[PDB]
Design a binder for these strands. Structure first.
Ligand SMILES: [Zn+2]
Lengths: 101, 43
RNA sequence: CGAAAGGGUCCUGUAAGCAGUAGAGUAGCCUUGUUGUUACGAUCUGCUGAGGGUAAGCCCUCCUUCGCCUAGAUUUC
RNA sequence: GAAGCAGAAUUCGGUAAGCGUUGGAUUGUUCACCCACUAAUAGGGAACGUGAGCUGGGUUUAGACCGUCGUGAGACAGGUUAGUUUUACCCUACUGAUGAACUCGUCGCAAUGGUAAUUCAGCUUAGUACGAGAGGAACCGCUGAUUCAGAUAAUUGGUUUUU
RNA sequence: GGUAAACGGCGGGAGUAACUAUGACUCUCUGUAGCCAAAUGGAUUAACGAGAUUCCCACUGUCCCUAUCUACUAUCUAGCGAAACCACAGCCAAGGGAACGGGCUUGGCAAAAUCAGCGGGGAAAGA
RNA sequence: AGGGAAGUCGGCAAAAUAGAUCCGUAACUUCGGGAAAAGGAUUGGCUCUAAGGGUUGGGCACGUGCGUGCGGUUAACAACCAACUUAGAACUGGUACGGACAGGGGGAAUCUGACUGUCUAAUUAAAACAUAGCAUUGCG
RNA sequence: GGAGACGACGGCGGGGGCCCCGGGCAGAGUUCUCUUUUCUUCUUAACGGUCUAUCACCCUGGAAACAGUUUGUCUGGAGAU
RNA sequence: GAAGCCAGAGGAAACUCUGGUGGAGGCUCGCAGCGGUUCUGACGUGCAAAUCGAUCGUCAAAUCUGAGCAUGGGGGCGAAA
């Protein structure tokens, strides 16, 4: 069940990308900038309960724990284990490379 | 924000509705639901 | 000129079928486990940028086929 | 054209209607005023010297409350709510489309009718003229943009019965 | 004579000399959350509603600013086939004292027969 | 597309919501309600696991398949039969998993009639009417 | 004296019919591959006989350590089990 | 998810709490039916002298409905328009 499926693909309804989520998992600084672009008082649960893999805020720790048992979270985990598509892999697909000397 | 989270006046994602809660508080102040008065000047 | 066909150009997204020491697990037969084995089993992989469509207002084709043709009727200082 | 009009920005006046003259807020209300953008947000007529395009207020058939008046039926100083008109195929006008007569056709002329562009900004002039200072132009030249108009589909978006 | 004291009238409180109704004649009147009541001190009444109104979030072709697609029409053909309405008719301009012209005066002008639309008049509202 | 009521007298119309499981749910209140308030997490396919039932059936000693006199409650065991729910786990596709269909938008308030109900067939469905409750009058 | 002869609603139990499942004979369809497959017939009236079927009623007996018992707490010294 | 009922935990008892059970209501979502709110709806010499679509109210009762019968114009009937 997706809320308002007609306008899911609009730019104003865009969700966070998987490579950005991978960078959030690798480096806490990048996650810190992403959380700086938000306001904690408007966040669900005052921004205390956050799943990095789903890039999602939850209203309580019980809600976050219950979300971890669902298949969307496991689908995100499987996608992250397979790896996110990046510009470097796009380069390697066509056999291009960067020459820095 | 505390009044909004207590009374369940939440927007989408649980964001507190400070606008509606402020309107409720103003109406309660105006319509004799919160006690207040101007003390008289002393002679 | 027409109808097909072939080639190109686009659109989709990898056909049917077969196979596989891929497949969570379950049940049998015996060497009672040593891919033990056989059976089933979403899915995965290979054959396979494959299959399908392509002018209906896409392109090319004397030199890829088959067919059509010097009419009929009406009228005019 | 005139003004202590230095410059810049203006003020008053003249010819001029070619070309524009905008979003928006507010219905406890004579809806008129506020805010902004802008070059500017000028004023009128063709209705209102009664009057069938669409649709809101003056506004008012029948239902109903509340107030005022009345013995009452009811009326009103009033306030509120809900409430049936429903063409076009005719003639003219207008927009387009054919066409007899002159053999058919090709290439032309042009009477007459219509007519179209508009405004701002930036670079240079130039930190120059002018000026105590603060500030601060213009002509020629160049490049964009606003509004309007006429086309077009290479590209990008939208549209999918290519079912 | 007594009132449903209903309608209605009705600023109070003292007095007197009247002595009963009607009196009449003077005087003068301005707790930042308490106390008291059988927890509460309420109508600022819950629930309910195709009742009337204002606002918020979501939402979006209501616009901005329009574009495109499908079906059925409209269109063309075969067959079939009405009605409303109709003094006569239908291009305008100025004038036509009675604030009205389509017909008159003076001008502009003006060329067969037709089709799709259109909604300015003219017609059209059981007007 | 981008913006999101800038439209309009007025969000009219449309869009958004919607099934089910689970977490959670305020003021007010006639204590019954409000309430599906609000606000959240999930849902496909496959392969398994677990739980929830029914029927039948006891050893001796005498008379002879029944009568006694006993003896025992581990049948807590065997045999056979049967159906639909519920919970848990792995694996797997994905732009969608109540995949069509079906299917509440929600909230803050004000006025108003208590509520359910009824009427102007063919312009008005309502603060109109009725209602239970309350009060008065007449009659032995 | 009985029958004729009697409200609305709720769940529970019995029976018929329908629906569903398995086997068998016969027939039909499918059959590149698969499918001991998918589908169709397989019935039994009124009227009678016989054996049975909740409630209730009868006999024995006398119940507290109360018992029996429905999904739903009713029954019993006015005699239960 | 109202009374009634069972169990457990307390309480001297009355009662209190917890988990079940039960199935009340001019209760509620909603199909048929009944009704008729809204829409610049369709239709406007119509399919129709009141019809059509979507939407909406109600849906176990003051619900819907047939036949028989009764009330007749100075009248009747009227949850009253
Ligand atoms: Zn997660």
């Amino acid at each position: 069940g997706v809320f308002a499926k007609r306008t899911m693909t609009k730019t104003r309804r865009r969700l966070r990308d998987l490579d950005q989520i991978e960078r959030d998992l690798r480096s806490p600084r990048h996650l810190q900038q992403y959380k700086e672009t938000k306001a904690a008082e408007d966040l669900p649960g005052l921004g205390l309960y956050y799943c990095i893999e789903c890039a999602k805020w939850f209203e309580s720790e019980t809600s976050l724990v219950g979300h971890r048992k669902g298949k969307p979270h496991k689908r995100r985990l499987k996608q992250l284990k397979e790896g996110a598509y990046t510009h470097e892999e796009a380069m390697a697909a066509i056999g291009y490379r960067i020459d820095n000397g | 924000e505390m009044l909004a989270r207590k009374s369940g006046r939440l927007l989408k994602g649980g964001e507190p509705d400070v606008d509606g809660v402020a309107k409720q508080v103003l109406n309660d102040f105006m319509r004799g639901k919160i006690p207040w008065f101007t003390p008289a000047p002393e002679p």
